[PDB]
Amino acid sequence: PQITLWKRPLVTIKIGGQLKEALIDTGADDTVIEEMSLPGRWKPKMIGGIGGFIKVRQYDQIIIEIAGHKAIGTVLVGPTPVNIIGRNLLTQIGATLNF
Amino acid sequence: PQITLWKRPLVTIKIGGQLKEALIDTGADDTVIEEMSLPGRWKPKMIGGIGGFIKVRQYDQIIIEIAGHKAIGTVLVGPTPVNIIGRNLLTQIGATLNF
Ligand SMILES: CC(C)(C)NC(=O)[C@@H]1CN(Cc2cccnc2)CCN1C[C@@H](O)C[C@@H](Cc1ccccc1)C(=O)N[C@H]1c2ccccc2C[C@H]1O
Numbered sequence: 001p002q003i004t005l006w007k008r009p010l011v012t013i014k015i016g017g018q019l020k021e022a023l024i025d026t027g028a029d030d031t032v033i034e035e036m037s038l039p040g041r042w043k044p045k046m047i048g049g050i051g052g053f054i055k056v057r058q059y060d061q062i063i064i065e066i067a068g069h070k071a072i073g074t075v076l077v078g079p080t081p082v083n084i085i086g087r088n089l090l091t092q093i094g095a096t097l098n099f
Numbered sequence: 100p101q102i103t104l105w106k107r108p109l110v111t112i113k114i115g116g117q118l119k120e121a122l123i124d125t126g127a128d129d130t131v132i133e134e135m136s137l138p139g140r141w142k143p144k145m146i147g148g149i150g151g152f153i154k155v156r157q158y159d160q161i162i163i164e165i166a167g168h169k170a171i172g173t174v175l176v177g178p179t180p181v182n183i184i185g186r187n188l189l190t191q192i193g194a195t196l197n198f
Pocket residue numbers: 025027028029030031032047048049050081082084086124125126127128129130131146147148149180181183185
């Protein structure tokens with residue numbers, strides 16, 4: 001598929017048995033998901049946005065399905081205002097920017 | 100070109116006649132550049148992302164070259180951690196996401 005940039009590039013994802021909407025974000029190094037109760041162990045992390053840092057829980061080896069394509073990797077969970085799919089997972093689905 | 104996402108998608112820009120490096124950021128609604136002197140009138144604005152808000156100067160109708168492609172549009176200037184090319188200018192240069 002191709003996604004234009006007139007509007008925020010939102011897609012459906014599946015994570016932890018739930019469907020959500022998420023932003024395809026080439027500027028994000030990491031994937032950040034809104035607060036949800038994912039199972040198992042996690043590690044504390046702080047991550048920086050344009051405005052400063054927030055506290056998140058780092059979960060490793062988490063499977064996400066992104067617009068029908070699987071990715072496995074690290075997912076950060078915390079109080080983000082949007083679900084963000086970052087480069088760590090976008091590479092796995094073969095996503096590119098083109099112009 | 101076609102840009103993969105294993106590294107940050109950094110490109111060279113020209114703004115106010117000066118070369119800078121900037122991040123292609125599909126998760127950014129707007130374009131924000133680190134503090135610099137820029138010709139034109141501006142108006143105060145606030146933008147928010149992860150971590151909160153920053154105060155910026157909004158410059159309308161600014162000529163900017165992005166990886167050799169011309170755009171003319173709104174450029175925000177302020178204490179962003181990195182120079183960011185957002186959707187307002189990515190649309191101008193014809194950028195799409197593909198997977
Ligand atoms: C891993 C994490 C998500 C924390 N990364 C970021 O936030 C990075 C931070 N770097 C910086 C950094 C910080 C620390 C270390 N390395 C890099 C700058 C680039 N952002 C990526 C942005 O695309 C993130 C989005 C998130 C968002 C989208 C919609 C609404 C709220 C939040 C973002 O901040 N977008 C905002 C945005 C951005 C620019 C201009 C205007 C606007 C408005 C809004 O679209």
